[PDB]
Symmetry: D2
Subunit: 101 residues, 4 copies
Amino acid sequence: ASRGVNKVILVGNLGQDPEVRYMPNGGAVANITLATSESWEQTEWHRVVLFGKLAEVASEYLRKGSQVYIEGQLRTRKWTDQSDRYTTEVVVNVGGTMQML
Amino acid sequence: ASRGVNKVILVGNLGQDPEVRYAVANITLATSESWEQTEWHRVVLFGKLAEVASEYLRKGSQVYIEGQLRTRKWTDQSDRYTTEVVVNVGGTMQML
Amino acid sequence: ASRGVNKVILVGNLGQDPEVRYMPNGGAVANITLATSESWEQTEWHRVVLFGKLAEVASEYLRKGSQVYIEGQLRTRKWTDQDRYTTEVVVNVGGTMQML
Amino acid sequence: ASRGVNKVILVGNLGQDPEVRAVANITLATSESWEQTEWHRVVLFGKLAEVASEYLRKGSQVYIEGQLRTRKWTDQSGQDRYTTEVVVNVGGTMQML
């Protein structure tokens, strides 16, 4: 990891059961939408993606309203649609973690 | 303001000098990772900080950032979503 | 708070109900010992002190086994008993506590 | 290794040069203001330990991410003593700024 730090920590509940899929060689890719709100109620939705082991467990133990802790990195990946688009996500890979609260 | 923790910590370098329009500086940083692959963040500072960055942050500048993620919805010339790291309430920025 | 970043993030459980105490002018001080463990087990205990509002709430809502999220700073303070140091996670400025 | 999250993030400067014994002990200072500086006892192992010994000198500014660990030791008077430190192990990390 040259250059600075890139890290996000989230604590929220999934607004929907874990969308588990399996990419080609090595099926293991889970997608969760984490919700975190605040007052002073303004809520924000998060697109997280878990891999390998974290994916599976996500799939086996995580369900809609579940609350979880997430430590991941911020990544924005572009893609041209059936019509250029960009989507930034919180990916959990290397020094990352996911956990049931 | 409970129910969940929205927090991103960043340390890295600016791509271009601070684009301050109006008490709001928009800064885009870079964070490399190797095993190359750089990643670019859209950080947005307000009030006090906005001005400090404007006055002390130049292109190369290395900084520490702590804010929250916010995805905002806008329609363009012809729907679009832009997620950025906003240093608001309990956030903070500093020169390294 | 220029120069450096002092910040710890904890998620764990309270080992025992919050020991709330009221300081001189403006009583609001809570003391919680947080437990975080690691298997692969090996646990580690943390002293956490809350203040004002967060203190009150802890008192009211937290109990023994409850699980929390803590964000604060590290402060080791010296005191000679009857020379010693005690390091703790203190929730002051940009800190926070949350029941999970 | 669940049940709770033990994590401290630090950015700051070394008091002395790295005291290497693969294990580097460094101490870090983070000041606050409203002065009042605070001193951290950081411990690096293996790979990082050596890097620190090789590139970190007194003034060096570094980013640290580790876990808190309080160690219980006895001490010549045969009295119990406790020392908490920031240990950069598993998912930890250190970097020069």
